[PDB]
Design a binder for this molecule. Sequence first.
Ligand SMILES: [Zn+2]
Ligand SMILES: [Zn+2]
Ligand SMILES: [Zn+2]
Lengths: 263, 134, 46, 33, 65
Amino acid sequence: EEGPQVKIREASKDNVDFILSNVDLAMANSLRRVMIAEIPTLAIDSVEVETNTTVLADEFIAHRLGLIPLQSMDIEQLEYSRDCFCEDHCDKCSVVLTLQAFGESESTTNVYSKDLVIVSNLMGRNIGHPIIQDKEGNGVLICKLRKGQELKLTCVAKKGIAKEHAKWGPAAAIEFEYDPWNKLKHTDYWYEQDSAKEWPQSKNCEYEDPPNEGDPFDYKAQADTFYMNVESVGSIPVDQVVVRGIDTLQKKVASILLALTQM
Amino acid sequence: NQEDSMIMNQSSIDRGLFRSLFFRSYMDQEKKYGMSITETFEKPQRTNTLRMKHGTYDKLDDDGLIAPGVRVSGEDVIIGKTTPISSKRDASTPLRSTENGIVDQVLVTTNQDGLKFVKVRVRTTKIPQIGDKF
Amino acid sequence: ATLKYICAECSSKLSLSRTDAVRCKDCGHRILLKARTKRLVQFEAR
Amino acid sequence: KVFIGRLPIMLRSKNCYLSEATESDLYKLKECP
Amino acid sequence: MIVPVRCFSCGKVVGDKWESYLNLLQEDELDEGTALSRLGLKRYCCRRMILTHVDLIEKFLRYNP
Ligand SMILES: [Zn+2]
Ligand SMILES: [Zn+2]
Ligand SMILES: [Zn+2]
């Protein structure tokens, strides 16, 4: 079809196990890098307290609230707050939320991301809806309330990336692996007695082939075959962590040609 | 990391890696002279003596105190005490110059003598820095 | 509404004039906290 | 018959209140168990 | 002091999975090992997060206001 190509091994809602071949070592790495930060995400930034009583302080609860993943679908249709012209926050750049809990029950009262309310109108774009991985439908345990522990809030959800702070982290931990049969000599294998006899041969090794001793050192060898597992937060559905990743890796390139022409 | 030091993942500190807290208290009393002359616990402003501190008195209410929950700055008043001599000298106690934070608890009782005792708290979120000890 | 002071134990609203007995009006205890500074406290999510 | 001097008492000791008081009584006495 | 919303090294939403770990052993009589893995704890970074944490919050809830 074209240049470097994909080999999807396993597909799910939070993992894309695939193989990447023909790509430069650098092109593989430059996306793994891009996926971890430079992908737009909506997560609380300006958390405003009305009344708190929880065992956690004003700024304690506030930290954890920004760490709550929220639906980040049409985030490239709501600009960064900064780039808008409003007084701090509005619908163009921010989708504000609220959280109004009180320890009513005689027992413990668990504040969940489900207790959040989208006040600032969403204008017709899938956003600001937390990621509920719970069976019970609860999703993201915020805190615990006993007696008259009242948590009256005002949480503003702005744009952002993990280069700014990991709470906008579109992904978790992307798996990266290449040249399983080390015929490129990429590593001086550690051993007391014997190399492979002490080192465990990888899962992704059932995809390249045995070295065979009756061969020389692969001096002419170069690295391709990039076995990757993409761990999604769920803020962006798996595929887009890869797609909106590749896309935003291109944008920073296209920005350089753009800069070369004003020059 | 050389000659004992070490590198740190900020993208991990961000989640809660070695994130901590630190809470400082403040003490003062409605000190008596005997002849029923007591230091006044309120918000003093110049007038008669003008022997006052330089910080922000403006944050404190009229019981000579900030109610807990307000963001304290650096050298701003946390304790508002006026010294009567024979008017508004002053012996107000402010935030420690170095520090910063938010007010946590504003406690006021009576001592064994029944002198208006104050106990204010300064709640700061100490986060891993570029030269903190571990 | 209108709660200048608060008790630590029983937790009961009070408010008293400059020298009007530092005492909760239920339990003898001289304790008490100064309640919320109503004014909205905006923060950071970091 | 006649009192002589106020002697400080050790926490969780003889005449001290804490010592006897249970986990619940502690979480009530606002003292850490 | 309560479940960290998400792991430190990776960033996988560990937050909710606490109320699901507590029962996974209490109820299902399981070992910690397979109970961590039954939630979805592959690499040790996320494993150490749910396992070696203490919900001190409850001990603080045991007080009055
Ligand atoms: Zn705007
Ligand atoms: Zn009382
Ligand atoms: Zn992890």
